[PDB]
Amino acid sequence: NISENTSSAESRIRDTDMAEEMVEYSKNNILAQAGQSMLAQANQSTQGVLSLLQ
Amino acid sequence: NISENTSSAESRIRDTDMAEEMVEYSKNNILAQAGQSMLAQANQSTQGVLSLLQ
Amino acid sequence: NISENTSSAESRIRDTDMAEEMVEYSKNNILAQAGQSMLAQANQSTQGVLSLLQ
Amino acid sequence: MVVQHNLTAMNANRQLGITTGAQAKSSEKLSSGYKINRAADDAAGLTISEKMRS
Amino acid sequence: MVVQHNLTAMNANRQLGITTGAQAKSSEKLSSGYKINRAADDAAGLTISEKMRS
Amino acid sequence: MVVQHNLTAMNANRQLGITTGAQAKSSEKLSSGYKINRAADDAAGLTISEKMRS
Amino acid sequence: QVRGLNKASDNAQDGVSLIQVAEGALSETHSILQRMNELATQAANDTNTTSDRTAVQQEINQLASEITRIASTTQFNTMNLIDGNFTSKKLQVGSLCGQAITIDISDMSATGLGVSGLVVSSFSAAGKAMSAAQDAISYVSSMRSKLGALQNRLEHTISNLD
Amino acid sequence: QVRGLNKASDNAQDGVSLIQVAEGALSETHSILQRMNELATQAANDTNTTSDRTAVQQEINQLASEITRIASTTQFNTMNLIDGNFTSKKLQVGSLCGQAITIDISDM
Numbered sequence: 001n002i003s004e005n006t007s008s009a010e011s012r013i014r015d016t017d018m019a020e021e022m023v024e025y026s027k028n029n030i031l032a033q034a035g036q037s038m039l040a041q042a043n044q045s046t047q048g049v050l051s052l053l054q
Numbered sequence: 055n056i057s058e059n060t061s062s063a064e065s066r067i068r069d070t071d072m073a074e075e076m077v078e079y080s081k082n083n084i085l086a087q088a089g090q091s092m093l094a095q096a097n098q099s100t101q102g103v104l105s106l107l108q
Numbered sequence: 109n110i111s112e113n114t115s116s117a118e119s120r121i122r123d124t125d126m127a128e129e130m131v132e133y134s135k136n137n138i139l140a141q142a143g144q145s146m147l148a149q150a151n152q153s154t155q156g157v158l159s160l161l162q
Numbered sequence: 163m164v165v166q167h168n169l170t171a172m173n174a175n176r177q178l179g180i181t182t183g184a185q186a187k188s189s190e191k192l193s194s195g196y197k198i199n200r201a202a203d204d205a206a207g208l209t210i211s212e213k214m215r216s
Numbered sequence: 217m218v219v220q221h222n223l224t225a226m227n228a229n230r231q232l233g234i235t236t237g238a239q240a241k242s243s244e245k246l247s248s249g250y251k252i253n254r255a256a257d258d259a260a261g262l263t264i265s266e267k268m269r270s
Numbered sequence: 271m272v273v274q275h276n277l278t279a280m281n282a283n284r285q286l287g288i289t290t291g292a293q294a295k296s297s298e299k300l301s302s303g304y305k306i307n308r309a310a311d312d313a314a315g316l317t318i319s320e321k322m323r324s
Numbered sequence: 325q326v327r328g329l330n331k332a333s334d335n336a337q338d339g340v341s342l343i344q345v346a347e348g349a350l351s352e353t354h355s356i357l358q359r360m361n362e363l364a365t366q367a368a369n370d371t372n373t374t375s376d377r378t379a380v381q382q383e384i385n386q387l388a389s390e391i392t393r394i395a396s397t398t399q400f401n402t403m404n405l406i407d408g409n410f411t412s413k414k415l416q417v418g419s420l421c422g423q424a425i426t427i428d429i430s431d432m433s434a435t436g437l438g439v440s441g442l443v444v445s446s447f448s449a450a451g452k453a454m455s456a457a458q459d460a461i462s463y464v465s466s467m468r469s470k471l472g473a474l475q476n477r478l479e480h481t482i483s484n485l486d
Numbered sequence: 487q488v489r490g491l492n493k494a495s496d497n498a499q500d501g502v503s504l505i506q507v508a509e510g511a512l513s514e515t516h517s518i519l520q521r522m523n524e525l526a527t528q529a530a531n532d533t534n535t536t537s538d539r540t541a542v543q544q545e546i547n548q549l550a551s552e553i554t555r556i557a558s559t560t561q562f563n564t565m566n567l568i569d570g571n572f573t574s575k576k577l578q579v580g581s582l583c584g585q586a587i588t589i590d591i592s593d594m
Contacts, residue, residue: 201472
């Protein structure tokens, strides 16, 4: 019984909540897709210099 | 519950609305091209001096 | 018996009808997908300015 | 059109928000299993349900 | 027209700067995912968001 | 623009790093099944837990 | 006007968002009072001996402290929301001077609901404690009925200002 | 005539633009009245005891304060549109003296 309660205590502290962590994972999979999107647009941002009488 | 509602509160302040900001991003994106076009034509504008009895 | 009836009464007032609410969920899931489509089309819709003697 | 205010997009953004609102207020009823989560849903349905719960 | 100072081009330049200043303030919010990246965006909103993060 | 220094992109590279870093620190917990894999995650979470494991 | 209406929309959402913190705290005040009423109903029965009503009283004293802990501790942006002192507070709900909506929130402490000192050591007092906790469910119903009706003004306000 | 007709065209758009603010504000007066009807329909039922009809009444008062807030607050160019003071206001929709259209809005 003390083993089941102190297992329940350590699983509180240290096992992943896979429910919660797949929220935090999927925020980041979207932000990485969005960051790669902005970085892809940003490398093409200064393409605007070249028309400029050159 | 309070953590959820004050996450919702801080998100409503600080997170980028990726829809509403992509509206404003894309105005400025077209204005930069329109302004680079208007500057590219502005540097051509005074070429009209050169036919002037020279 | 009064408990089974007043439980049934409260459940009529307050438990989600999951059948009905998954209609109203899936309306909004399509409308959000269609609204994101229309917003994504709308942001590109003023790309028409740039051919215009520019 | 105007380059400075994509009102086609701004209205589409305003309507996308109204729709993701209705989505987050529906998804709440399915994750919880209740039709009145907050007294903003039904002030009588709350007040009566707390008497039937009582 | 004066040959020595192309004032139409200096206006177009000075308006191009104001436009790509606004464009970098947008690109920053999309790439990071935060509306308020720095205290110049909302001093009240940075302050309240830190008390809510806290 | 400055042609030599795409700061719109350098900030986006930098914010992408914060994002894909946070993603690998999340992905570790789903692949391992544990919340504290490394004592850097929670010094008391680790220290308490090893006494509960013991 | 556009800049001001966008702050008015942001402030009406900062109002909805505050209201939800108060409303969602009183949701556990209900859930504590639903438990105090059920505990009082059980302790009222004179098949209970003395030790087995002081065993109920230990949970009623602890749950009354928890209603006061919900009250003094729930905050939004460091302001207490249901201690009785969120009164005369205003939302700037438009572009002009003083286009208010008012937020007032009666005290939701165990004293403010009369559940401080529910005494359940006899049928007479444990019925007195049923009466008190059913009035407190009726008070938290009436306060959540105001905070709910108010969130419905602001959802209409945000739909309007936008 | 052309210069005048172009201010006339812009004044008819300042006219359309004003109307859309009022026609938009009354679009939430519908959302509020559709809600007040439905609340009143719920409160008519003689299963509600007194404490449940005061719980309805809190919203039927708060929402009626809202219909007055929409009316005394919706403005265009600092003029109230639907408080009942937007009576007899003339748009000039041509090049010549008094080629009017009249905007006239009852109290909402």
